[PDB]
Design a protein around this ligand. Structure first.
Ligand SMILES: NC(=O)c1ccc[n+]([C@@H]2O[C@H](COP(=O)([O-])OP(=O)(O)OC[C@H]3O[C@@H](n4cnc5c(N)ncnc54)[C@H](OP(=O)(O)O)[C@@H]3O)[C@@H](O)[C@H]2O)c1
Ligand SMILES: NC(=O)c1ccc[n+]([C@@H]2O[C@H](COP(=O)([O-])OP(=O)(O)OC[C@H]3O[C@@H](n4cnc5c(N)ncnc54)[C@H](OP(=O)(O)O)[C@@H]3O)[C@@H](O)[C@H]2O)c1
Ligand SMILES: NC(=O)c1ccc[n+]([C@@H]2O[C@H](COP(=O)([O-])OP(=O)(O)OC[C@H]3O[C@@H](n4cnc5c(N)ncnc54)[C@H](OP(=O)(O)O)[C@@H]3O)[C@@H](O)[C@H]2O)c1
Ligand SMILES: NC(=O)c1ccc[n+]([C@@H]2O[C@H](COP(=O)([O-])OP(=O)(O)OC[C@H]3O[C@@H](n4cnc5c(N)ncnc54)[C@H](OP(=O)(O)O)[C@@H]3O)[C@@H](O)[C@H]2O)c1
Lengths: 244, 244, 244, 244
């Protein structure tokens, strides 16, 4: 039974991921920041399924919280096999009106946070000479998007970072890959607001917004599949056709 | 039970693919060109497993053979759900000594053949408003490789072609993706010869050549997964770190 | 004074390229297939400018014509410094209605022709331990386009091919790069017809179709610049924002 | 005469860029952080050439300094036509031993600094409905590199950011492109130390390290060429063959 750490597992994509790895019987550390109750329900579901779960409230943009989150999984089970860096937020605004704080917040969490988590997981994984790290980026990091210079910067940064992380870990058998989802129905997407959501829908060749379960399916393949042990330093896009 | 057509399924990657989709209980048309006996054994294995199989000898670079191959699956089962365009060959030589026939043969099979197969599958899939097409390319189509201008051209061509194929089929719900494998141990690779095979091995970050089963695993995800229904027009690389 | 061979130099982009390299004083072989008169006028203009020019009617999809075209420049001047593989055509149609002849014609010229020309130039360039080859592809080879599976395949193929060509020539100091233009106003584009041309115009972030001179400017940099001697195996896109 | 602002113009690439745009007669704001004397000499050279120059000491990772740097060019000449975001540093170390301060410093300058500069230039350029922004990234942002997770993250981030910047500015006719150099002989590269520099040299197909003038040549094309007005949201690589 693999030990999986999923950041931002209380809602949306991270939650679908957590439930799916639980249903496959993994030991899952469900991290949350503010949604304690929602994480607990996730833990309970994983359990009803036969997986094992421990909830952990911590801000992944803070080193202390990150070192603590890893410690909790290691104290509970003996190691960490997989880490899915999913936590993220948006602070949308045209480049011309963007406040430095809007830039910093997105960068601190979405980019630096992924660095902290990856670094922490890696030190543990090096010793065991095995592990998998999956970072959730976005198609926006690839093809940009109006009103999202901050988010685009952070997501693109996750990709360049994951590639070096892949190179450094190759020696100790640690796979590092990135998943780039397109428009997925979640709370993050509910914020851009309906008339806009519809607008985006005519932009998607497959004419359908993706579901959190769609991403989880792909993450599950990368995390558990024996085949995926030969995949590193790559970005995998599930976007229904946007970034063709 | 999905009906899957796999070209070049008598040996290497196509065979691993055929066996794996059979073990999952699909109805598999195992195509072969010259290895009749080896295809039959594949058919038998699929059967021992509980999948269904029909062997079909045909050259996929010929329209007639292609239209015939599709007909045989349609006469047998009622439709085709998935087509995996795997058949391919190499005719290596420096650009400076390359004969037009060495260029043509690689192009006719590896590129035009994929066009023929995709076109044929698509006409059938459009009517049913559903289907998945997976084309096997190569990392060489992405980053080139000395002694393989012909193969690089054809493989890169498969990618551009698959992207348009993805756009045209999006409307009728047909997913088209490409898989780009790195060095995989097979008969194709056995031909470059040992001292060379070793040389290539120090070029692979994960320090391991891939196995046909590694590719099959990924193809199986793309062919069968509900998650993969949201993936189109993308190239997926399994190369142990070469093309990072 | 560099000797430059430009294929398809009688009209559109190839012509703008020919005129611009002539105005910079190069010796230019202006190739044409059917537009003899238009090539002659190009030759005359180059001359009025102070460059030197020789017209050559030949089909670049034929080996004989290609070997002949190279011979003519070599007999005239002592060598070839730059080759710009520009000749190309389109045979648009949905994948579902595409005749094999429509596929073949686009592939024979746009892909194989580039192989023939590059191969011929390379054998000459290897001996001199210097040279530059610039292949004109298209943004379509990168992001696909409905109604152009053939063209997309050929253009993408040009890219993979150019990358291997770059690797093989690196040793003898031969640079090989690709230029990918977006929508450029020319006879090729006049064929898609007005209501369509307007439609495409709202797709271009810079809201302007490109001009043949725009491409020539970039080709001139790659062909003549001392800086461009450090650039190989790359694709350069001038598309006013389509493929961001 | 275009007004060009070049960040980090006292040494290496930024300096070659400054000299070259000066020799073409632009008005150049040469920014520096600590090398006041070296910037002055650059200013003098530009002048001996017939260009115009004003030196400006400021840290481009600070908003105040950035707003001040723009003000100085605007007070001097009436506007800004081109901004080249060149300033950058490295803080190399394996991911496993990387201090948060080593991460932050590289991110603050190389990524956030580019945001500050681009934002400032853009507000000015929007009003004039014209301008060009060229951000210097690195091939490392594309293909990663051991010991440089921080730098790779920042450089990749510059690319995603530049793409959104391109989209937002398209409307007001502002071009935004990125240049990705490979190994260039400069003080930045002198720091990795000789036995390493030699090692890297056998990795370069063209078997030559690039020169600051090579990058300047390409930047000059993008900054001044009428042709480059049709180029946006793209990354241009000069790396002698590394990232093929
Ligand atoms: N939705 C899309 O269309 C789309 C497209 C591409 C990529 N993505 C990416 O997918 C990931 C999740 O997508 P989403 O749509 O699922 O968003 P969401 O519904 O808003 O969920 C974000 C999650 O992040 C957690 N979180 C926020 N700040 C955190 C912090 N400082 N530390 C630790 N956890 C934190 C939240 O937990 P609490 O509520 O408990 O605080 C929450 O579970 C993000 O990386 C997002 O960028 C989404
Ligand atoms: N091996 C690698 O490292 C690698 C890396 C990247 C991509 N790939 C690709 O993977 C696919 C298969 O790999 P491989 O290594 O499996 O090669 P392989 O062991 O040589 O098998 C090639 C297969 O193609 C079939 N075939 C050949 N010509 C055909 C034709 N004209 N029509 C129909 N079927 C034909 C052969 O069947 P018969 O013997 O019955 O004639 C055989 O089953 C190819 O597309 C290859 O390019 C391989
Ligand atoms: N126009 C665009 O928007 C666009 C976008 C991307 C790429 N491109 C590419 O740019 C190149 C030229 O563009 P274009 O728009 O300039 O097209 P064009 O105006 O139709 O000109 C094509 C040229 O090719 C020559 N040619 C045709 N067949 C030939 C053959 N078999 N052998 C030798 N020369 C031949 C023609 O010469 P003759 O008339 O004398 O026969 C003509 O000068 C092509 O590779 C095209 O794919 C164009
Ligand atoms: N060298 C390469 O191989 C290579 C490869 C790819 C990309 N690049 C990029 O090229 C750019 C320059 O390359 P380089 O090799 O030229 O480096 P360099 O020789 O070390 O020069 C860096 C420059 O940045 C300036 N600078 C440093 N910190 C600054 C700050 N906070 N604010 C404003 N200016 C600052 C320095 O000025 P002062 O000394 O006056 O403080 C100096 O002129 C960087 O973005 C680097 O990443 C270089």
């Amino acid at each position: 039974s693999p030990v999986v750490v999923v950041t931002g597992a209380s809602r949306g994509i991270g939650k679908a991921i957590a439930l799916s790895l639980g249903k496959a019987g993994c030991k899952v550390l469900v991290n949350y920041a503010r949604s304690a109750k929602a994480a607990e329900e996730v833990s309970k579901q994983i359990e009803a399924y036969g997986g094992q779960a421990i909830t952990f409230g911590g801000d992944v943009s803070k080193e202390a919280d990150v070192e603590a989150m890893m410690k909790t999984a290691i104290d509970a089970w003996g190691t960490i096999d997989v880490v899915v860096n999913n936590a993220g937020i948006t602070r949308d605004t045209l480049l011309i009106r963007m406040k430095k704080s809007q830039w910093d917040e997105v960068i601190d969490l979405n980019l630096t946070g992924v660095f902290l988590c990856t670094q922490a997981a890696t030190k543990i994984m090096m010793k065991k000479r095995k592990g998998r790290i999956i970072n959730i980026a976005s198609v926006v990091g690839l093809i940009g998007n109006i009103g999202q210079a901050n988010y685009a910067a952070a997501k693109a940064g996750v990709i360049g970072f994951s590639k070096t992380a892949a190179r450094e870990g190759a020696s100790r058998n640690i796979n590092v890959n990135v998943v780039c989802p397109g428009f997925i129905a979640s709370d993050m997407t509910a914020k851009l607001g309906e008339d806009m959501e519809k607008k985006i829908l005519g932009t998607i060749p497959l004419g359908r917004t993706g579901q959190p379960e769609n991403v989880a399916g792909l993450v599950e393949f990368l995390a558990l599949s024996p085949a995926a042990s030969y995949i590193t330093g790559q970005a995998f896009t599930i976007d229904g056709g946007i970034a063709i």
